[PDB]
Amino acid sequence: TASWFTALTQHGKEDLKFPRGQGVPINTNSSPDDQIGYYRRATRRIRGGDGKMKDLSPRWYFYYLGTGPEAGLPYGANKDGIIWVATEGALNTPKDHIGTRNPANNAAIVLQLPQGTTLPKGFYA
Amino acid sequence: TASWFTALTQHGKEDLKFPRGQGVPINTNSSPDDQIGYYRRATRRIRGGDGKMKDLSPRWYFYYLGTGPEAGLPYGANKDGIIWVATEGALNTPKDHIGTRNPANNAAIVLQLPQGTTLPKGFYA
Amino acid sequence: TASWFTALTQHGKEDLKFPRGQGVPINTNSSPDDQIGYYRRATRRIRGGDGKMKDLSPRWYFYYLGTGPEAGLPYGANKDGIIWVATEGALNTPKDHIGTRNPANNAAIVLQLPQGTTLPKGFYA
Amino acid sequence: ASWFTALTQHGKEDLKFPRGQGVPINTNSSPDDQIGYYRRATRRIRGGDGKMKDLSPRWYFYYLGTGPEAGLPYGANKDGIIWVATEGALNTPKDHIGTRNPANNAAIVLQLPQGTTLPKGFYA
Ligand SMILES: [Cl-]
Ligand SMILES: [Cl-]
Ligand SMILES: [Cl-]
Ligand SMILES: [Cl-]
Ligand SMILES: [Zn+2]
Ligand SMILES: [Zn+2]
Ligand SMILES: [Zn+2]
Ligand SMILES: [Zn+2]
Secondary structure (H helix, E strand, O other), X not given: OEOOEOOEEEOXXXXXXXXOOOOOOOOOOOOHHHOEEEEEEEOOEEEOOOOOEEEOOOEEEEEEOOXXXXXXXXXXXXXXXXXXEEOOOOOOOOOOOOOOEOOOOOOOEOOOOOXXXXXXXXXXX | OEOOEOOEEOOOOOOOOOOOXXXXXXXXXXXXXXXXXXXXXXXXXXXXXXXXXXXOOOEEEEEEOOOOOOOOOOOOOOEOOEEEEEOOOOOOOOOOOOOOEOOOOOOOEOOOOOOOOOOOOOOOO | OEOOEOOEXXXXXXXXXXXXXXXXXXXXXXXXXXXXXXXXXXXXXXXOOOOOEEEOOOEEXXXXXXXXXXOOOOOOOOOOOEEEEEOOOOOOOOOOOOOOEOOOOOOOEXXXXXXXXXXXXXXXX | OOOEOOEEOOOOOOOXXXXXXXXXXXXXXXXXXXXXXXXXXOOEEEOOOOOEEEOOOEEEEEEOOOXXXXXXXXXXXXXXXXXXXXXXXXXXXXXXXXXXXXXXXOOEOOXXXXXXXXXXXXXX
């Protein structure tokens, strides 16, 4: 039950967000109706030699609307660690036909945004 | 068994088809003789998030001639859910030396088509 | 265990062969003295639907001299399925410090050859 | 493990970089992050005379505050350790990057910006 795409890594202190109309990863094999979903934050911690937990940079993964760990949330749902993106013309319907990725069958698609969209401040890949 | 490539998803009512000479997926690990095969339609049925059974958008998978579920089908044979493609110069011989994909050893190759390929309405690549 | 590089796939009828001075894969993290080794043919066979054994295309993998499945062979050793390549300036000494690749620790380097060299007839990647 | 493949020392000269050079290229890191150390590792094999022989030493990069010398302050003198930092990097531990787990990630091929000076016997 993995994301179809590689993650965005949060080095800065600000949560991920995109202006309305931006942020949907490029997927040339999908329809314009499909271009809508959410990024979900995944946090990891590593115990250091002093016994204390240290936070690795949070990673944000994209899931199409109606798929993934938050498949039940409607577009725009207000929830910590969840942010929403949609391209103009996308349909607000669940993308059941896309679903999630089986890592044993498909490798992750390298997340690419359009040539005119840059990553939000503090985000790297 | 499994197609070497990801599927083309049929988003509309038009079935998959290609003008003569078009439609063979890009694969640099193949010769001009090898550029011939068929797409096979596959349809899924699932229970939606609302708890109702629905038919998903059909998916079309490419297999080289003489491989896959219709390995015994001669090139050009009429069969529902099967359409044929061949690049100019391809040979009407079975492609056993390419075969099919074992998901345990190889992930699927993202299906790419050259620019200028005519696609029916509802198909994207 | 594995080769540091991806394989060359033999679609044609001719064994792999390079003119003297060509054929060593590009690896900018190695020394000029290191640029010498062999390609080893690996063949896979599958029993077809007609009960006949089918040969998948042979794959040729590069190993530095003194490493890999034929680590004991001297340069130029005459053995079926083994062909030798060396760049001008390479030293005829075993490359123990390079060794082979652990696929769990390193991905395969995509095999690239210098611009002046083209793949022998019938070979693809 | 180090996030990157090693720099192999083919000759007698140890690894070192002029000030400002030597940090591996990593697009998943900020300008603040471009600082760390290389640590030398040497393995042995039995030579033709039966005596143990040094193979070419390998130098692995770790971000500041991570890896085997995570407790070493930047610039600390220790044999087998050399320090590198790009202009603009911050002298703070890079715990948010950490080290690589070979089960989840393969090593990144170590690349250096064009014009980087390497000692004799080093290639990248
Ligand atoms: Cl940072
Ligand atoms: Cl789709
Ligand atoms: Cl062929
Ligand atoms: Cl080397
Ligand atoms: Zn950082
Ligand atoms: Zn779709
Ligand atoms: Zn072929
Ligand atoms: Zn070397």
